[PDB]
Symmetry: C2
Subunit: 264 residues, 2 copies
Amino acid sequence: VMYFIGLGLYDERDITVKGLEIAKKCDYVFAEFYTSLMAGTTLGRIQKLIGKEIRVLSREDVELNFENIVLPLAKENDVAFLTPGDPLVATTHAELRIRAKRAGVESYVIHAPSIYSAVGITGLHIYKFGKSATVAYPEGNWFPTSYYDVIKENAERGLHTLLFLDIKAEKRMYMTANEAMELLLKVEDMKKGGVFTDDTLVVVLARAGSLNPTIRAGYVKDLIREDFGDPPHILIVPGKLHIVEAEYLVEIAGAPREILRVNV
Amino acid sequence: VMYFIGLGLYDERDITVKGLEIAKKCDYVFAEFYTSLMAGTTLGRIQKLIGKEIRVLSREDVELNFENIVLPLAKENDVAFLTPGDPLVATTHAELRIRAKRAGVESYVIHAPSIYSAVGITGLHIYKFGKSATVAYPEGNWFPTSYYDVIKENAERGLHTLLFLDIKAEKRMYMTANEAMELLLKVEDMKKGGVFTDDTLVVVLARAGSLNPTIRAGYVKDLIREDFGDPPHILIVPGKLHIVEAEYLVEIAGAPREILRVNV
Ligand SMILES: Nc1ncnc2c1ncn2[C@@H]1O[C@H](CSCC[C@H](N)C(=O)O)[C@@H](O)[C@H]1O
Ligand code: NA
């Protein structure tokens, strides 16, 4: 059998009891730390907590040799594949389950807290979020913009936008909410849809999962230069607020009391 | 100090290690099972795993008296507030942190798996979900249908719509995917907007969190009367599929081959 087990958001403890119970009694343990950053732990602590040796795999080992490195062992033993947060959220690991099927391997998913639901601690109603997007680093003469249209589309409907920030694990590069805002501003001049400016209200959630995450709401002009701590970060562009969402942003995220005055 | 700790998705093992340890160091432990129930376990088993007695709070005990029942103790003690899923996902829970602030009480959030990220196991891409909704039971002269317009607006833009099904927590009466489909067909007959029909494709997820969840995909006309096992049930109406999504539904969720040409 094959086990996809999420490790959670911040540290090793963010794993579900079920996850740890099963990880402990597995023959082989593999993992990847390229889809996200667990800024609160080390491979050692995970290994010490699990009680097994962990073979960390690269994006390539996975995307090209999952069935060559992991699956073979899964037909004779109980093998676990570990990932940050929930293993099937904002990743392409879901497809790996098909590889397992075609390989004669039974696979199970043990969920864990994901950043996709952790946004609830921002005060924004989770059901009000619309389509999601990723702000990707520009590479060479290629400048990604799609995520800008996502914000626009949701904005018209009154919905919130969750922006997954880019990550270059191998270069130990983790995009900050600031870089994301600087990129959006640049796309705003390029497109001029009045979708993202200095006056746009944004929400920053940094290091969710830690007992002391950074939750900040405010205008780009004021937050674009603010220090939100070490990564990972996520950026949120709220749609039409609800009075209680606004009260939470002000009371808990330190937003300008003037946002309380919702323009229904 | 008080802790909002998520209980997870299905059973008492879905709580995170961090959540279980903290709940054990708490002087008092409250829990609510009105926003949702844990069908994979019991209050007795959760009480035993933590090794603390747990006082259950009704919907009114919380929404009306949270500050007179839970917060008082949090002054000279460490209190735990357990909820199914991930904390603050339930819409009225985030405002409780404002109550905690108002009362001079520090609050921390201990995340856990939520259905919002767990639906990833359907093989649908998270970022493609739009606004979410709850299918409510008609009753008396009230026949709510806004959840239909959500499916309409989401699908229109190629987005998946996550549908929470009704629940009468106290009476422990869940709405089945079947009843939800019957209801939608009935609503389509009302508004006739070509949103939900016998030919519409849907995905039914039952018992997320369990090692053996029920994942089924197919046309309403073939699922409207299928048995998906015991509750809870989540209904999902996908927009235009990504080929990789369709193959997953065909391979893992038992969807018909027809979707590889019809819904891609
Ligand atoms: N604890 C955390 N705090 C803030 N952002 C986080 C985060 N975990 C993930 N992210 C965000 O999501 C990106 C990884 S996307 C993969 C998400 C992961 N499977 C999950 O379930 O969370 C990061 O670059 C960051 O922008
Ligand atoms: Na969503």
